[PDB]
Structure 1
């Protein structure tokens, strides 16, 4: 699954207007809250790719789940991602990276990363909104720091007093080999880009 990401800084000074705008020109909003976790590989010698993206990223929707519970850490639904690097010297047109949406269901969840020998690493909470557009979808970011490690009790800690809202257009190609589907996708994202360039400044960014 080759995702076609986009990025767009939103100053918080003007953020509400962007919301009132997008709500009147796009599907949704759908509420977004999620709790990332990264569990670190720790092996030597190379060749370990040991890349900053190579570190694994488990994901979990947490919004519907109530804040009071503390056993959410396993009882909650979970998933796993890789997200490889974007293809080199990719400008004008959106950057493109491989992504794999793994899922799993058992009482044993987190433990498995230790079963792979992986251990706890950096983590952060995301909050924002998603907007549908047929296949393509745009999600807006807020990377709140949890009040405690693996805790779901507000307030959560902002990186700074004025955290930018990180707009993120994307779509999920079923497979890279199909330049036809690539064409339809690049087309859809192009139309989205035109659709919201009037009040925002998206651009390709290397990853």
Structure 2
């Protein structure tokens, strides 16, 4: 799967105004609250690390063992393509959703070990067949815990603006072109309040 995207940063002081602008020009938003745990094979190559995502927006913070009562999406994110400066970014992204018992332990059995984990807090909008997410990456107050509070990595942490769309087949030239065209439309639509550009991933 191919992910075409644009990235931008929104200072904490402008958050309110940018969100209202996004609500005035786009469809949405829907809240985003995800728990991510990353596993690496047991120069390191992170594009081969397993990135597990659980939607904690649908959990009881009181649930002592939420990780076993959840569905995890498993991702493999490659490095974005180079020489695409001044153009939208592109990177390979593969996904598979897995359940049954404790996925965490299953991936360790496959030969992987825990690397790091974090929480994503934000809003998600939609327009021109693309998704625009504005979020902050947080740190659990206790490893593998969904019980607040969650701490920012820095007190003057900006919000990240990530605009993207997915194309199933990289070979489909028409689909790829329609996606870049859609990103371009969203870019100018948000250019009045946020600079979006290709950033390496």
- More helix per residue: 1 or 2? 2
Normalized against structure 2, the TM-score is what?
0.96
- CA shift, 1:182, in A, is 1.1
Normalized against structure 1, the TM-score is what?
0.93
Structure 1, unmatched stretches of 5+, are 43-48
CA contact (8 A) 1:90 1:206 kept: no
Deviations 1:65-111 (A, max 9, x none): 12111210121111100111111211111110010111112124111
CA contact (8 A) 2:5 2:183 kept: no
- More strand per residue: 1 or 2? 2
Quote the residue 2:66 is aligned against: 72
CA contact (8 A) 2:52 2:73 kept: yes
Aligned-residue Cα RMSD (Å) equals: 1.2
Quote the residue 2:132 is aligned against: 138
Deviations 1:26-75 (A, max 9, x none): 11110000000011212xxxxxx731232211111111212111210121
- CA shift, 1:178, in A, is 1.0
In 2, the alpha carbon distance for the partners of 1:186 and 1:204 equals 12
CA contact (8 A) 1:35 1:125 kept: yes
- CA shift, 1:157, in A, is 1.1
SS of alignment partner, residue 5 of structure 1: strand
Count of aligned residue pairs for this structure pair? 201
In 1, the alpha carbon distance for the partners of 2:92 and 2:124 equals 21
Segments of 4+ moved more than 4 angstroms: none
CA contact (8 A) 1:34 1:127 kept: yes
